Amino acid sequence: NLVFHNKVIDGTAIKRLISRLIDHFGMAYTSHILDQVKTLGFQQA
Amino acid sequence: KVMTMDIERLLLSEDNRFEFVNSVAAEATEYVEKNRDEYGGTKKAIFHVLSNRVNDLGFDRPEAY
Amino acid sequence: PPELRPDINELYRRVIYRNNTLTDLLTTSGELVMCQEKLVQEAVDTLLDSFSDVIGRFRETLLGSVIVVGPSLSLHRCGLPREIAIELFQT
């Protein structure tokens, strides 16, 4: 679904991404997608 | 885990979120009136209503998942 | 009733005393009677506005653990301690 970024995640960029995810999928997917991106962020940090 | 997607599906099904939740409360209180089995342990009447309704949507979920 | 007032008791006592004194001066046998009528008026007015100082009950009587951040929770979960849950769910 989503475009491959190949570019750095600014805070504005992730605000765009999360908003577009909520608008595309609704809460159902995005509440899991964001909750997994939590774990990804923790891992890479 | 998955049960909230069913909730969202039913939220997407019903034309008013508040009316949906009212209908769930009604269904649960009439369930706990038409049946007087205790039905209060590891499975709960709310989850039962959600399960039966998603089964009406045709989806293979067991009672209280 | 006293169960709703277990400072205003002093005001009720003062009103009771002033009124009983005024009745006594009316009945036992006029400018002193008038003086007691005045002091009864003052007592009642002080007691009403006091109730006005009690009037606030809408906010005071009608309205009105430390957290730990846990990565291992899901976005919809929380961890509820045994020592608290055994109190919360007791019924």
Cβ–Cβ contact B17 with A under 8 A: no
- Chain B CB contacts of A31 under 8 Å are 4
C3 half-sphere exposure, CB direction, 13 A CA radius: 0
**What is the token pair recorded at B24?**
């769930």
Reported in sequence order, the residue ranges of chain C that DSSP labels E, i.e. its strands, are none
Experimental resolution (Å): 3.5
Residue A40 C-alpha, separation from nearest chain B C-alpha, in angstroms = 19
Provide the terminal-to-terminal Cα distance of chain B, rounded to the nearest Å. Answer: 9
- Put simply, the answer to whether B12 touches A27 (Cβ < 8 Å) is no
Tell me how far the alpha carbon of residue C38 is from its chain's centroid. Answer: 28
Method: cryo-EM
Q: Is B30 on the interface with A (CB under 8 A)?
A: no
Residue C18 contacts residue C39 (beta carbons within 8 Å): yes
Secondary structure (DSSP) of B7-63: HHHHHHHSS-HHHHHHHHHHHHHHHHHH--S---SSS-HHHHHHHHHHHHTT----T
Contacts of A39 in chain C (CB under 8 A): 71
CA B26, C74, A28, A10 torsion: positive or negative?
positive
Q: Which chains touch B (3 or more CB pairs under 8 A)?
A: A
Size of interface A-B (CB pairs under 8 A): 8
Distances in Å between the Cα of C52 and the Cα atoms of C7, C45, C49 are 13, 10, 5
